[PDB]
Amino acid sequence: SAKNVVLDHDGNLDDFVAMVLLASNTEKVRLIGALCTDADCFVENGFNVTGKIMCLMHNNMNLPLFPIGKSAATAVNPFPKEWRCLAKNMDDMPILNIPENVELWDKIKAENEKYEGQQLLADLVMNSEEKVTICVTGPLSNVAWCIDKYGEKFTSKVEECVIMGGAVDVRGNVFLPSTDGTAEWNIYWDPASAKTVFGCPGLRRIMFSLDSTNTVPVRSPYVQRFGEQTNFLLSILVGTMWAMYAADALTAAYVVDQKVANVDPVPIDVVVDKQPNEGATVRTDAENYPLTFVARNPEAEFFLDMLLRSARAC
Amino acid sequence: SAKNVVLDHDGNLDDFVAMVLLASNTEKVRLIGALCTDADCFVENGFNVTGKIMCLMHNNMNLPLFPIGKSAATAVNPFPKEWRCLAKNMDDMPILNIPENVELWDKIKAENEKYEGQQLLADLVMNSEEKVTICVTGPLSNVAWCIDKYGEKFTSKVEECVIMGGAVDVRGNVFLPSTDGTAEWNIYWDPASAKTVFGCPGLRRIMFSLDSTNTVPVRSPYVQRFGEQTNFLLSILVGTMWAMYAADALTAAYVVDQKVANVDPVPIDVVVDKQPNEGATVRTDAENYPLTFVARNPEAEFFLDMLLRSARAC
Numbered sequence: 001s002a003k004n005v006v007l008d009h010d011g012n013l014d015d016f017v018a019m020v021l022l023a024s025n026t027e028k029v030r031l032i033g034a035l036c037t038d039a040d041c042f043v044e045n046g047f048n049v050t051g052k053i054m055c056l057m058h059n060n061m062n063l064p065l066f067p068i069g070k071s072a073a074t075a076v077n078p079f080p081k082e083w084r085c086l087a088k089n090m091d092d093m094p095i096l097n098i099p100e101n102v103e104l105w106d107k108i109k110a111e112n113e114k115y116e117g118q119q120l121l122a123d124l125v126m127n128s129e130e131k132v133t134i135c136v137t138g139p140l141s142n143v144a145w146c147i148d149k150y151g152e153k154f155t156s157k158v159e160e161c162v163i164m165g166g167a168v169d170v171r172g173n174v175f176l177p178s179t180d181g182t183a184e185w186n187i188y189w190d191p192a193s194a195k196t197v198f199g200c201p202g203l204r205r206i207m208f209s210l211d212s213t214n215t216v217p218v219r220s221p222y223v224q225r226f227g228e229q230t231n232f233l234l235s236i237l238v239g240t241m242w243a244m245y246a247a248d249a250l251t252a253a254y255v256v257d258q259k260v261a262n263v264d265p266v267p268i269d270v271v272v273d274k275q276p277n278e279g280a281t282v283r284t285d286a287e288n289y290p291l292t293f294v295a296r297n298p299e300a301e302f303f304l305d306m307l308l309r310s311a312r313a314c
Numbered sequence: 315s316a317k318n319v320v321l322d323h324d325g326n327l328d329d330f331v332a333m334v335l336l337a338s339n340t341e342k343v344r345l346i347g348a349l350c351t352d353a354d355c356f357v358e359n360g361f362n363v364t365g366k367i368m369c370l371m372h373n374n375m376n377l378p379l380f381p382i383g384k385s386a387a388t389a390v391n392p393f394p395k396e397w398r399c400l401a402k403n404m405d406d407m408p409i410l411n412i413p414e415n416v417e418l419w420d421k422i423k424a425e426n427e428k429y430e431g432q433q434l435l436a437d438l439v440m441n442s443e444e445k446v447t448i449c450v451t452g453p454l455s456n457v458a459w460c461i462d463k464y465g466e467k468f469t470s471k472v473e474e475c476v477i478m479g480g481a482v483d484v485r486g487n488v489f490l491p492s493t494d495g496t497a498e499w500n501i502y503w504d505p506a507s508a509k510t511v512f513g514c515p516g517l518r519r520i521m522f523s524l525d526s527t528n529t530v531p532v533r534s535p536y537v538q539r540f541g542e543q544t545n546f547l548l549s550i551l552v553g554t555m556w557a558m559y560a561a562d563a564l565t566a567a568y569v570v571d572q573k574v575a576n577v578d579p580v581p582i583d584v585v586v587d588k589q590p591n592e593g594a595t596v597r598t599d600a601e602n603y604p605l606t607f608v609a610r611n612p613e614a615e616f617f618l619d620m621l622l623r624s625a626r627a628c
């Protein structure tokens with residue numbers, strides 16, 4: 001009885017580890033689509049790696065092909081105009097360039113580049129028979145777009161929106177000359193969109209802010225364990241990426257199984273003014289403000305084992 | 315018959331690609347040892363990756379084990395601390411952490427740690443029945459040391475030195491506020507040792523400066539071709555290292571087959587004074603100054619095809 005899931009990411013290492021986690025857990029998750037945003041990665045690269053991972057898996061296990069869209073979303077505050085995306089690097093990974101798999105990608109490529117990510121997310125959620133879980137591991141610009149365009153017609157079709165982003169009771173990670181460091185990148189990239197989502201009633205939001213994601217670090221001894229499963233392509237793929245925080249992986253791990261963490265209802269608002277704390281997710285005492293279920297104290301061992309086992313799907 | 319060879323590297327990405335070229339070509343090369351310097355890497359990381367690569371190949375293609383030593387050389391001008399981490403990443407790579415290989419490495423790890431790199435190099439060249447070819451892909455600190463300590467007892471046993479470093483008729487790659495950009499990193503790291511090596515009459519030198527290494531770029535299309543050989547452990551290894559220029563690889567290539575490039579005799583001196591051009595390799599007027607054979611116009615295709623084929627050894 002797998003549930004419909006859509007992955008809304010921005011093509012980074014953990015975004016792809018998160019993709020693998022959703023896709024390899026066929027018993028609990030039916031991945032019906034994915035979209036890429038040109039934030040923490042050049043969309044072109046993020047799009048290609050998404051296709052390459054889907055095909056590698058499609059040809060080795062039970063994984064139906066799904067549509068992949070590039071989002072026309074634009075940044076309000078762009079990521080480090082230096083180093084970020086490793087999507088280009090991954091694009092050259094040998095495990096993702098096996099001829100039979102790239103051949104499939106070349107063949108089904110044209111169909112996908114015809115979609116516009118934002119509209120695709122809307123159509124996958126709204127045309128679905130059963131509800132869909134949106135796993136957002138990049139900015140919230142796309143979920144807000146759908147909300148602003150289709151309102152309740154869109155949200156009522158959402159099972160729940162599992163989000164990686166924010167910093168509630170801990171410091172953020174956006175450290176620029178104009179920021180005080182209380183905000184987190186995914187939110188800071190487009191504060192306005194984040195406000196729309198976090199303030200939209202009728203939408204169940206699971207929030208994986210830095211409060212929870214900072215508790216699951218990437219440690220060498222764990223990563224080395226993938227060397228024990230080199231007979232599985234996914235172990236070579238995941239081990240390699242991590243050899244290079246597991247925020248997005250944790251977020252996707254929850255969609256796979258709730259036991260990853262307990263949630264705590266908190267009224268979340270977003271700072272949109274052009275101040276040092278722009279993009280910070282704060283608490284609001286506004287009367288009956290929609291509550292967001294903030295993830296806390298993640299079962300780290302449960303997650304790490306989930307990932308190790310999942311990398312054995314193929 | 316194959317020739318004796320020792321690899322003197324500093325554990326960066328192309329140093330390891332070079333090691334794979336040398337070790338895999340058993341018919342031409344008999345790798346009798348390697349040392350790792352704490353230059354463009356943190357020696358301990360480069361140490362282990364060397365052992366992991368050695369053991370992976372030993373258990374999969376009959377590559378005789380050999381001693382690996384840690385050079386005690388210390389920098390004159392340290393490398394950018396942002397580059398020296400590559401070895402760390404490689405140490406966690408799935409393909410280098412297979413159990414049977416790590417078990418072997420862990421058994422022979424202590425003994426190799428007993429060696430001092432420099433002394434090891436001197437002892438391997440001096441105690442060899444046949445002459446030895448030294449492939450230097452990191453600073454020249456170790457060769458300079460052996461020359462100072464044992465003079466001709468050492469250099470007389472050296473078939474030739476194939477070195478990656480310097481910049482003769484082109485600009486260097488060392489750009490700091492206090493430099494003029496004419497020096498290359500391997501020399502800048504330790505100019506004095508470099509001057510000793512280049513000025514030593516009694517030593518045969520093959521120099522792959524930037525003049526030749528800049529003419530052979532390693533592009534994405536090429537790298538992706540290792541995706542056609544994921545059934546070979548080394549193709550996964552090499553293609554992966556790059557996904558994360560190949561000056562060092564060209565140098566090892568020459569050692570495998572000299573058809574890689576033609577050479578030109580040039581009398582090379584090294585600027586050791588703390589000047590804007592410190593570490594620059596310059597032509598000198600000194601009469602009877604020893605000649606160095608500078609690589610010219612390397613054979614691009616030949617090299618690429620050599621590496622692609624060599625990545626199929628196991």
Ligand SMILES: Nc1nccc2c1ncn2[C@@H]1O[C@H](CO)[C@@H](O)[C@H]1O
Nearest residue numbers: 326354451452487498499500561562
């Ligand atoms: N980005 C970079 N620029 C210059 C040299 C670099 C480099 N990354 C690694 N190197 C090292 O420096 C030498 C070439 O200058 C090589 O031995 C190589 O291992």
Ligand SMILES: [Ca+2]
Nearest residue numbers: 012015137138
């Ligand atoms: Ca992300």
Ligand SMILES: [Ca+2]
Nearest residue numbers: 324329451452
């Ligand atoms: Ca090097």
